[PDB]
Scaffold this active site. Structure first.
Site, PDB file in Angstrom:
ATOM      1  N   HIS A 159       9.713  53.496  67.668  1.00  0.00           N
ATOM      2  CA  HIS A 159       8.735  52.428  67.844  1.00  0.00           C
ATOM      3  C   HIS A 159       9.425  51.070  67.950  1.00  0.00           C
ATOM      4  CE1 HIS A 159       5.463  54.926  65.519  1.00  0.00           C
ATOM      5  NE2 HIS A 159       5.888  55.525  66.620  1.00  0.00           N
ATOM      6  N   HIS A 188      11.849  50.648  64.749  1.00  0.00           N
ATOM      7  CA  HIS A 188      12.182  51.677  63.763  1.00  0.00           C
ATOM      8  C   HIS A 188      11.947  53.062  64.361  1.00  0.00           C
ATOM      9  CE1 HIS A 188       8.374  53.572  62.285  1.00  0.00           C
ATOM     10  NE2 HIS A 188       7.850  52.527  62.904  1.00  0.00           N
ATOM     11  N   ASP A 211       6.920  42.741  78.750  1.00  0.00           N
ATOM     12  CA  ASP A 211       8.072  41.835  78.848  1.00  0.00           C
ATOM     13  C   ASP A 211       8.984  42.167  80.028  1.00  0.00           C
ATOM     14  OD1 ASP A 211       7.029  41.037  76.383  1.00  0.00           O
ATOM     15  OD2 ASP A 211       8.716  41.809  75.219  1.00  0.00           O
ATOM     16  N   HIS A 247      23.151  54.626  58.946  1.00  0.00           N
ATOM     17  CA  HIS A 247      23.880  53.428  59.337  1.00  0.00           C
ATOM     18  C   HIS A 247      25.391  53.487  59.159  1.00  0.00           C
ATOM     19  CE1 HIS A 247      19.981  50.861  59.197  1.00  0.00           C
ATOM     20  NE2 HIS A 247      20.256  51.237  60.434  1.00  0.00           N
ATOM     21  N   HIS A 280      20.458  52.479  69.305  1.00  0.00           N
ATOM     22  CA  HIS A 280      20.397  52.480  67.849  1.00  0.00           C
ATOM     23  C   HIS A 280      19.239  53.356  67.360  1.00  0.00           C
ATOM     24  CE1 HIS A 280      21.025  50.521  63.823  1.00  0.00           C
ATOM     25  NE2 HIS A 280      19.760  50.882  63.693  1.00  0.00           N
ATOM     26  N   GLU A 281      18.050  53.142  67.920  1.00  0.00           N
ATOM     27  CA  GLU A 281      16.879  53.880  67.461  1.00  0.00           C
ATOM     28  C   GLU A 281      16.954  55.374  67.775  1.00  0.00           C
ATOM     29  OE1 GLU A 281      15.533  50.762  65.382  1.00  0.00           O
ATOM     30  OE2 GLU A 281      14.901  52.857  65.311  1.00  0.00           O
ATOM     31  N   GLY A 302       7.740  62.846  63.728  1.00  0.00           N
ATOM     32  CA  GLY A 302       9.180  63.008  63.628  1.00  0.00           C
ATOM     33  C   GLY A 302       9.833  62.739  64.972  1.00  0.00           C
ATOM     34  N   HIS A 347      18.827  57.181  65.156  1.00  0.00           N
ATOM     35  CA  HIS A 347      17.963  57.555  64.037  1.00  0.00           C
ATOM     36  C   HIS A 347      17.083  58.766  64.379  1.00  0.00           C
ATOM     37  CE1 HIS A 347      19.215  54.336  61.494  1.00  0.00           C
ATOM     38  NE2 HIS A 347      18.536  53.363  62.078  1.00  0.00           N
ATOM     39  N   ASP A 367       9.038  46.818  68.336  1.00  0.00           N
ATOM     40  CA  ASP A 367       8.137  45.723  67.988  1.00  0.00           C
ATOM     41  C   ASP A 367       7.794  44.868  69.212  1.00  0.00           C
ATOM     42  OD1 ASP A 367       8.271  43.208  65.282  1.00  0.00           O
ATOM     43  OD2 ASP A 367       6.765  43.585  66.837  1.00  0.00           O
ATOM     44  N   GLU A 368       6.543  44.942  69.648  1.00  0.00           N
ATOM     45  CA  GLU A 368       6.127  44.186  70.818  1.00  0.00           C
ATOM     46  C   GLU A 368       6.228  42.673  70.601  1.00  0.00           C
ATOM     47  OE1 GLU A 368       5.252  45.510  74.156  1.00  0.00           O
ATOM     48  OE2 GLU A 368       6.112  43.490  74.131  1.00  0.00           O
ATOM     49  N   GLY A 399       5.702  66.408  65.044  1.00  0.00           N
ATOM     50  CA  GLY A 399       4.737  65.329  65.088  1.00  0.00           C
ATOM     51  C   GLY A 399       5.392  63.976  65.246  1.00  0.00           C
TER      52      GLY A 399
HETATM   53  N1  LIG Z   1      18.923  40.000  61.680  1.00  0.00           N
HETATM   54  C1  LIG Z   1      19.236  40.377  62.916  1.00  0.00           C
HETATM   55  O1  LIG Z   1      20.391  40.348  63.352  1.00  0.00           O
HETATM   56  C2  LIG Z   1      18.082  40.878  63.789  1.00  0.00           C
HETATM   57  C3  LIG Z   1      17.129  39.738  64.122  1.00  0.00           C
HETATM   58  C4  LIG Z   1      17.697  38.687  65.041  1.00  0.00           C
HETATM   59  C5  LIG Z   1      16.600  37.904  65.718  1.00  0.00           C
HETATM   60  O2  LIG Z   1      15.951  37.080  65.036  1.00  0.00           O
HETATM   61  O3  LIG Z   1      16.366  38.139  66.923  1.00  0.00           O
HETATM   62  N2  LIG Z   1      17.355  41.920  63.093  1.00  0.00           N
HETATM   63  C6  LIG Z   1      17.939  43.064  62.760  1.00  0.00           C
HETATM   64  O4  LIG Z   1      19.077  43.360  63.123  1.00  0.00           O
HETATM   65  C7  LIG Z   1      17.105  44.004  61.898  1.00  0.00           C
HETATM   66  C8  LIG Z   1      17.239  43.644  60.414  1.00  0.00           C
HETATM   67  C9  LIG Z   1      16.293  44.420  59.507  1.00  0.00           C
HETATM   68  C10 LIG Z   1      16.376  43.975  58.063  1.00  0.00           C
HETATM   69  O5  LIG Z   1      15.743  42.956  57.720  1.00  0.00           O
HETATM   70  O6  LIG Z   1      17.070  44.647  57.271  1.00  0.00           O
HETATM   71  N3  LIG Z   1      17.429  45.408  62.107  1.00  0.00           N
HETATM   72  C11 LIG Z   1      16.745  46.140  62.974  1.00  0.00           C
HETATM   73  O7  LIG Z   1      15.881  45.655  63.749  1.00  0.00           O
HETATM   74  C12 LIG Z   1      17.049  47.607  62.990  1.00  0.00           C
HETATM   75  C13 LIG Z   1      16.902  48.105  64.418  1.00  0.00           C
HETATM   76  C14 LIG Z   1      18.073  47.888  65.357  1.00  0.00           C
HETATM   77  C15 LIG Z   1      19.429  47.658  65.115  1.00  0.00           C
HETATM   78  C16 LIG Z   1      20.048  47.537  66.374  1.00  0.00           C
HETATM   79  C17 LIG Z   1      21.486  47.336  66.714  1.00  0.00           C
HETATM   80  C18 LIG Z   1      22.496  47.385  65.761  1.00  0.00           C
HETATM   81  C19 LIG Z   1      23.830  47.212  66.142  1.00  0.00           C
HETATM   82  C20 LIG Z   1      24.154  47.016  67.485  1.00  0.00           C
HETATM   83  C21 LIG Z   1      23.142  46.984  68.439  1.00  0.00           C
HETATM   84  C22 LIG Z   1      21.814  47.158  68.055  1.00  0.00           C
HETATM   85  N4  LIG Z   1      19.119  47.700  67.346  1.00  0.00           N
HETATM   86  O8  LIG Z   1      17.968  47.892  66.718  1.00  0.00           O
HETATM   87  C23 LIG Z   1      15.973  48.251  62.107  1.00  0.00           C
HETATM   88  P1  LIG Z   1      16.225  49.994  61.665  1.00  0.00           P
HETATM   89  O9  LIG Z   1      17.625  50.197  61.133  1.00  0.00           O
HETATM   90  O10 LIG Z   1      15.810  50.930  62.789  1.00  0.00           O
HETATM   91  C24 LIG Z   1      15.154  50.339  60.319  1.00  0.00           C
HETATM   92  C25 LIG Z   1      13.804  50.040  60.431  1.00  0.00           C
HETATM   93  C26 LIG Z   1      12.925  50.315  59.387  1.00  0.00           C
HETATM   94  C27 LIG Z   1      13.406  50.899  58.219  1.00  0.00           C
HETATM   95 BR1  LIG Z   1      12.203  51.264  56.792  1.00  0.00          BR
HETATM   96  C28 LIG Z   1      14.761  51.203  58.101  1.00  0.00           C
HETATM   97  C29 LIG Z   1      15.637  50.933  59.154  1.00  0.00           C
HETATM   98 CA   LIG Z   2       9.899  41.883  64.379  1.00  0.00          CA
HETATM   99 CA   LIG Z   3       7.800  63.533  67.714  1.00  0.00          CA
HETATM  100 CA   LIG Z   4       6.947  41.294  73.743  1.00  0.00          CA
HETATM  101 ZN   LIG Z   5       5.994  52.688  63.672  1.00  0.00          ZN
HETATM  102 ZN   LIG Z   6      18.938  51.345  61.910  1.00  0.00          ZN
END
Ligand SMILES: NC(=O)[C@H](CCC(=O)O)NC(=O)[C@H](CCC(=O)O)NC(=O)[C@H](Cc1cc(-c2ccccc2)no1)CP(=O)(O)c1ccc(Br)cc1
Ligand SMILES: [Ca+2]
Ligand SMILES: [Ca+2]
Ligand SMILES: [Ca+2]
Ligand SMILES: [Zn+2]
Ligand SMILES: [Zn+2]
Length: 159
Positions: free
Chosen positions: A92, A79, A20, A124, A114-115, A88, A118, A94-95, A86
């Protein structure tokens, strides 16, 4: 609380690159995302291309070999595993998202901040303004700042 790294020198490696964005823009987004956290902690991050990195940065699709399968475009964007050996620490992305340097699609820099949060052991935030708020929403990356809550969080883990 949760697990933390027991050292202040931490390496990362970019396992692969999203098509991308161009390569230098991915390197830049990731480097700046680590810098956000090193700016408020004793932690130092070095990119390696050869060797055993602590934090592997990966772009992958759907079911990609771990217990956190992706869901196509939208939904989960990425996530990351907390501190540990390892897998840990690994982060990752999402492509099936369209990664960008900007407001279109999904901003890689903001997602990486954000990642990496974690990856360093943060959970959070309840602050809608915190980068560790659970849901992604774009903010002008030119004026991006950690919230006071993000800084409290990471400083409670390191230093
Ligand atoms: N709902 C949204 O606003 C966008 C999608 C918008 C779109 O369609 O483009 N998605 C999101 O914000 C999703 C929602 C996930 C859910 O369903 O709970 N969140 C995620 O994708 C989380 C990843 C994220 C959050 C942010 C962020 C937050 C605030 C400010 C700036 C950036 N940047 O990446 C996922 P995660 O917390 O790493 C995670 C993954 C797996 C597990 Br098991 C536990 C935790
Ligand atoms: Ca996705
Ligand atoms: Ca590692
Ligand atoms: Ca892509
Ligand atoms: Zn993964
Ligand atoms: Zn998160």
């Amino acid at each position: 609380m949760g697990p933390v790294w027991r050292k202040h020198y931490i390496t990362y490696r970019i396992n692969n690159y999203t098509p991308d964005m161009n390569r230098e823009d991915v390197d830049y987004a990731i480097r700046k995302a680590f810098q956000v956290w090193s700016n408020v902690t004793p932690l130092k991050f070095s990119k390696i291309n050869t060797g055993m990195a602590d934090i592997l940065v990966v772009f992958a699709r759907g079911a990609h070999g771990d217990d956190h399968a992706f869901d196509g475009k939208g939904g989960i964007l990425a996530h990351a595993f907390g501190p540990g050996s390892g897998i840990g620490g690994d982060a990752h992305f999402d492509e099936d998202e369209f990664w960008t340097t900007h407001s279109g699609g999904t901003n890689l820099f903001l997602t990486a901040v954000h990642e990496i949060g974690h990856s360093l052991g943060l959970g959070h935030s309840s602050d809608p303004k915190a980068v560790m708020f659970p849901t992604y929403k774009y903010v002008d990356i030119n004026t991006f700042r950690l919230s006071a809550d993000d800084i409290r969080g990471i400083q409670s883990l390191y230093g």
